[PDB]
UniProtKB/Swiss-Prot annotation, chains A, B:
GO MF, any single term: myrcene synthase activity
Broad class of where this protein is predominantly found: plastid
Protein residues bound to (2E)-geranyl diphosphate: R242, D279, D283, R421, D424
Residues involved in Mg(2+) 2 binding: D279, D283
Chain location of the short sequence motif DDXXD motif per the record: 279-283
Record's comment describing the protein's domains: The Asp-Asp-Xaa-Xaa-Asp/Glu (DDXXD/E) motif is important for the catalytic activity, presumably through binding to Mg(2+).
Summary of the tissues where the protein is detected: Trichome.
Record-listed E.C. numbers: 4.2.3.16, 4.2.3.121, 4.2.3.122, 4.2.3.20
GO biological process annotation, one example: diterpenoid biosynthetic process
Record-given protein name: (-)-limonene synthase TPS1, chloroplastic
Amino acid sequence: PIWSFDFVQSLPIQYKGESYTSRLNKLEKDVKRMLIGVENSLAQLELIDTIQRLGISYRFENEIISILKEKFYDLYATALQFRLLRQYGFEVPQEIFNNFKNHKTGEFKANISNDIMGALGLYEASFHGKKGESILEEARIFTTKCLKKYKLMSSSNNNNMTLISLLVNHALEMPLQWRITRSEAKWFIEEIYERKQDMNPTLLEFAKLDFNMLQSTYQEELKVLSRWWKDSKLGEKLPFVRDRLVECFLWQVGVRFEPQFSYFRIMDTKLYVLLTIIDDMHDIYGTLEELQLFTNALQRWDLKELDKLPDYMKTAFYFTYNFTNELAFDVLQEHGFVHIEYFKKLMVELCKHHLQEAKWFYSGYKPTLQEYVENGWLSVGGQVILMHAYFAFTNPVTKEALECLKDGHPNIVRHASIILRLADDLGTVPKSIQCYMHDTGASEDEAREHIKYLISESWKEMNNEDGNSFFSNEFVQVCQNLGRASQFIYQYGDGHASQNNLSKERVLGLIITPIPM
Amino acid sequence: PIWSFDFVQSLPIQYKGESYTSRLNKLEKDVKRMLIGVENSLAQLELIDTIQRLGISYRFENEIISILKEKFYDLYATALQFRLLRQYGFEVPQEIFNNFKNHKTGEFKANISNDIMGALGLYEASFHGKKGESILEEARIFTTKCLKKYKLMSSSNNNNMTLISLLVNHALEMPLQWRITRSEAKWFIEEIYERKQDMNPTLLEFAKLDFNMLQSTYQEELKVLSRWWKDSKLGEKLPFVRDRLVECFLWQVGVRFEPQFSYFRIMDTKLYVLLTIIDDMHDIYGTLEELQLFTNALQRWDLKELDKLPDYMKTAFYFTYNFTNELAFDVLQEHGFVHIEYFKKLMVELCKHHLQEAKWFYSGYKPTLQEYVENGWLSVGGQVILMHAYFAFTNPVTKEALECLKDGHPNIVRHASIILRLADDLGTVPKSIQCYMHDTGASEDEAREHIKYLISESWKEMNNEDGNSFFSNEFVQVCQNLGRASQFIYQYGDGHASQNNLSKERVLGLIITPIPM
């Protein structure tokens, strides 16, 4: 394929050594003492936001949390402070922004259009809102309408795309809440922070160094995963499967980018691959009777079923068997109990909903958007990924949590899988926009706008959890990272199934090519 | 442990790059054209023997085979030619050496004691003999008796240990037939070939370069295996298990050292680890009832048995389950058929014989040497290793071979496992020499000499296969490499269970420390 085995194995891992780690520690200490050493309360928020956009805020978590606990005015500062407080799980309602609404009409002032900075800050802060908060929704609408004016008013003057115009373009493309850490980090390092007048060399060097060392760790993990894909022989036994190993690894980079989760990024990778093998087999390769035999064998969960399957079905079923048992083994070694039945039921439910999609296709039935979503958020496999993340990042797990999970999937998990499915259908058997155009009859742009509305509502749903919940803040952030990676992979083109220039360039910039120091 | 995780991960893999591979290819071409370009027929045999002792003969296999096919006189040349011919599977009986026996008495001439070179060559050639060949046995005896004279006659003059005296010491310690490739290669590079007057720089540089690149590949494999051992958590859940990962990797280096078998060296490693976990649990940790429950669960082969086991038993049983299913998965991906029943029966037989040893221990019964061997060659786990090697190196496998394997284990496999068990008991529940001292009543040195006699007879057994056999030459060589690694690990001290200076030095010289160029 495009990322051949020898090319992956040959990648010179540069940013690794004692000198690199020593420089990283020194720069981290310097940046920490610079962050806590800020005397201006507003400049401290600005520096925190810069560190967040640089992708290095995961190291200074507790320091920022303490600063924000201590931090407990124009529109820009209000929006920035609101976004930070709500981003670190601190309660702060929408009603504050009522200080900027002309309650003679119930809408924000028109002079906001003169403050592009405050409008951009409010636009960025509007995506952290929860369901029921209508002031944030109207603020999102008004700020989008304001930013499009800056687009038609500035970029049309000339290619004088000022750093403000670059940020406006970047926000209109996707808000910071919805973007992943690595892509935004690279973009803010290369295009923005390097051009700022107030730019500090220590922060820039530290961000570049951390990014390149993370790239080197990713390269090592990708070599390991490429050797695994080689010795798995899943390409030979299953010729229909797309060789998208690097794409699943990019998925993992979008999910958990931190260096200490390396092992996870491996396992989940294979999981994605497994899920992909189950996807391509259901919608492209297998027939109805063969997929029915596969789902039956999954229900029975025994190897004597292999005799009643074709060879590719044998390979796929045995791979699923071994991977599910490996998941159960890891859960046993972690939490000290067997849970093979739960993962078996997860896999059987996934294949049940895939077979449901297949039977709907072959029976000629066109489901509504509601039924399609209710079946697809389970037939997309996001629940398996999120349960793997749950049992990998939640410790300890109580009997009450196990009883709550045995009676369905969490709401945050369901809406994250909904976001996953809707983003996957974006840019690509009738699906999401096809069913909505079948039922309501609106145009294609209207259907895609309705799908984006559903995505925004599910994002509000996920935002509700960031506030006694049975899920840690870590797991909530992993679900939101799944959503962000969904919106990152299928943002522009079909980066999962098509090998276009964007699919090359994202992988090059995030994995192979480091940032020039 | 002594080889910590961070130390393994930090190992700077030096001999890797385009320049190293280019130099290797150039030197390999030069050495090949030097080998085939030898005009003297005897000097060609000498160069072939040198390349063999340098450990690089695995690259020039077909060229040497052609030369020896074309090659189809004093005592040294006769012995060298005989050893090479019999080493490459060419039939040449013992009767040739009848040209050196004084058939007035039926014993070799006394003037052989004046030709230390010819005596050493005959000693080296005597170990390639098969059962029934008595002339080679008497030649082995006579040449050992001759070499001990050179020991008491030369090394006693002074520390003028001439290169001849060094070779005599090395041969008396262990013959070349019984030594592994990497250790003999390092020793012949550092102590002997560098000091020869006729030494060629191209051969020396090529041997050192190939050895160091193999060391780098071993370092990468060991990093991967150390990460696997980390994420397996077998040390935490099972505190009784010795952390001998590097020792199992050294075992693999002794079994299959060639660069293209990297993947194998990983899998078999884990297998060894698994076997070790089954060993330490049977003879040290578990009680009779717990091991009985474990063997019962292995027979039933279901996860519902985990509920009827303690936690460490749960971990061990689930690890065995997953590893056996992974073996079956690899065999399916390779040969296109399921064989989970065969590997399950292998594991159940291993645990059956381990439980037999345990029940003999707790019942106070002291078995004879014959019964002990018949139970221990199966309770040592060598058959599992050799079946893994069989299904990894034999392709295709015919129905007749599968029917022959379903009715017991091969003779070569049985005697290789016998060598394994007897060497493991060397230097260490009554065992091999204890049972023989119980039955016959002889002293300890006499019992160990009888054990060495059994080892030599099993070596003759294995030598019989090198001659329509259902096993490829590759598999025969892998079995003999298992035997050589057995005699290499337990040669001097308890390198498996004790962490003495020799256990450090072998690992340092064969893995960490490369040969100075």
